[PDB]
Symmetry: C2
Subunit: 425 residues, 2 copies
């Protein structure tokens, strides 16, 4: 049921988003540590670095919002909604505006230390690339939907080095028609594999955090994850309800408050980046902090509360964000602390407290997004671990069932409804 | 978008097909080794075991065809087509006939040493159970399609201890409507997880063949798997073309030749089982032979050809089969032999020859079935290995692309057209 010209077209897509997605992370992290290095050169005398790192990170986030509007307010926030909508009819996609602004803007946002979120810019930039190439390749109407849907999944793979995830993204959440070329899967796979290959060439080839050795997970240890699910289920429910309210508060003007909204929220995050803790930035560092570097059970709770608020305060403000990675650090910090405690009560059933630290790593995403299958893979692909599956599933799907048992609604569909409601911006 | 009464029903589904699916394999393997032990008890003097093992395996397959019609000719062959049809409209499904016949018949077939194929019975029985508990739960119209689609995916999972495969099965090949309850995924995941948890309870918990240590796969080693895909692409093309033509031969009577077809084909396999070599039986043993027990490069090609024919001969005859496992054993033998040879020409790009042996393990399935995503997941879940991914993807989707580049068509969709053509049996 497959058609050649398109497959080779997806090969072009994944290749572009790979170079841009990988090239993006490197460019951002270089700016991240450059500020951190500027903070220690001025650190000695005195808190002059307290000022300089505030003017920089503040001016970066401020110039981030200004380049958003007026230029292309379509880049605000995540990236899944804007493409999830275009793929379905509502909301237009223009690449010559999204591509060069979601990039030059997203860089100033993530580069200042905001609580996001590579998979944000890369997924939209990738969808735009899928359109840019679709126009270059003069493909049909249904085929150019595929190229954009491919560039979307590739954008995810190019952020977490996870192909199967970017594939399962389109497959579960953001479910498209594809009529009747249901073999656009082939176009996806192609687009993703190529993306991660270009990724692994620039900064590969290993995963995000390979916890490959932990493989002792007994059968009578699963009951704990039902509870790890219920915990993350209500966690997702409160994450959504909160985000929505922070969005409201930000939507409520005033005209002079938004003038400074960027400079303020940015400089405040600029200071918070100076404290030796993973309380700011994308969220990868926060996952590389639950595990492995052992810290106080109190400090976990300290950072968990720190980020859980700062992400909502960040994304709600409507900066060029990305909500996947932040929900990975927030979830991991918890799952690790929950891990310690369950091993504390029952060590005879959780011999390795890292198993439960992996299972509930993408359980927040699973709950808030209603999309467990695409979360379960995301974890497997950044830990190279599959032995954690039976836990992973139960703690990810029970995490979703519960959140929508309290009635939370998929954070992206509701995030889309709100971006639709700006049919006059 | 999820509805509780259905999720809790899927729990019942997978749990039942789990108990049956596992209880099925063990009950079959018990008959496999029982005959093999009877063969060695009478082995000493003389070839009297040559006669006994022929009568038994011949009388089983003959009894298997007899219980097929008149009773439930719907249980003939695989199980994907029948359910793929009922799920789409054409062809009816009645559990009170399929369940008990596909079981007692499948036990006699696989228990005799036929070239199949647990996923056959377990998937169709799983579909039957999904329907049986669909009436018990008085589910709606669309919900009972889900319950049957779940039981199907669980059937696969129960056979290979691979949840993510049974989930990707329904998702890619055998793509259903689900309108607009696209979150039947939660019903699938649930059904698969439960099944494998019941599976691991009875015969778990480890995979089929764990090859978790091989994790060195360079980026400039990929080009080989393109070529490994080209090889399987043509291998699948001929596997389909062949199967179809073997089927024609069997469909062409005579009315007196079919009277003995069951006894003749069965006793022939009964003799072949006695040879110390994995050329009969499901195909698991075949995969558990490529790796690990090292045997002559010549013996590989001797077994490969032997099985490649014996499978078509066993399935084309319209016996209660299952074509996944047989296609795995064949592919593995080939992928290993191709591995040795590639490591022979370039060791500085295939340090570990087992890496390539894993990639093209499910590339025969990928090519023949047009379903790469489900194959890629099937392999990962039976090797506990994710490091093989980039090869696994390239070698599996290029295995499929080539297959339908020579235009082979999905072996299941065509298998469905042929069972449709029997709208008069
Ligand atoms: Br996102
Ligand atoms: Br099958």
């Amino acid at each position: 049921s497959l058609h050649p010209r398109t497959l080779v077209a997806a090969i072009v897509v994944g290749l572009i988003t790979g170079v841009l997605g990988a090239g993006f992370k490197s460019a951002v992290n270089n700016m991240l540590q450059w500020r951190s290095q500027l903070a220690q050169i001025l650190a000695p005398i005195p808190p002059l670095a307290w000022l300089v790192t505030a003017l920089i990170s503040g001016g970066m986030v401020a110039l981030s919002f200004w380049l958003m509007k007026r230029f292309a307010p379509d880049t605000s926030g995540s990236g899944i909604p804007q493409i999830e909508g275009h793929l379905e009819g509502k909301l237009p996609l223009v690449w010559q505006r999204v591509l060069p602004i979601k990039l030059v803007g997203g860089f100033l946002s993530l580069g200042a230390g905001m609580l996001a979120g590579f998979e944000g810019p890369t997924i939209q930039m990738g969808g735009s690339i899928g359109q840019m190439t679709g126009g270059w390749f003069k493909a049909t109407q249904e085929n150019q939907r595929i190229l954009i849907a491919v560039g979307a999944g590739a954008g995810l793979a190019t952020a977490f080095n996870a192909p199967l995830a970017g594939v399962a993204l389109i497959g579960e959440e953001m479910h498209p028609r594809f009529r009747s070329q249901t073999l656009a899967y082939h176009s996806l796979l192609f687009g993703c594999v190529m993306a991660t290959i270009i990724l692994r060439m620039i900064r590969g080839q290993s995963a995000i955090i390979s916890l490959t050795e932990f493989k002792r997970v007994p059968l009578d240890s699963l009951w704990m994850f039902i509870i790890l699910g219920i915990l993350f289920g209500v966690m997702g429910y409160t994450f959504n309800r909160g985000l929505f309210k922070v969005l409201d508060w930000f939507d409520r003007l005033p005209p002079l408050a938004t003038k400074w909204k960027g400079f303020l929220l940015g400089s405040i995050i600029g200071i918070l980046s100076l404290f030796p803790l993973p309380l700011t930035d994308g969220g990868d560092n926060a996952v590389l902090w639950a595990f492995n570097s052992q810290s106080h059970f109190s400090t976990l709770i300290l950072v968990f509360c720190g980020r859980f608020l700062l992400t909502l305060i960040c994304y709600g403000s409507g900066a060029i964000g990305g909500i996947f990675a932040p929900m990975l650090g927030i979830a991991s910090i918890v799952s690790v602390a929950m891990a310690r405690h369950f091993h504390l009560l029952f060590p005879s059933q959780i011999p390795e407290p890292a198993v439960m630290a992996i299972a509930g790593m993408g359980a927040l995403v699973a709950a808030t997004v209603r999309a467990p299958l695409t979360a379960i893979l995301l974890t497997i692909e950044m830990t190279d671990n599959y032995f954690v599956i039976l836990p992973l599933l139960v703690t990810c799907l029970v995490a979703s069932v519960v959140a929508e048992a309290l009635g939370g609604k998929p954070i992206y569909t509701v995030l889309l409804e709100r971006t639709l409601a700006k049919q006059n911006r």
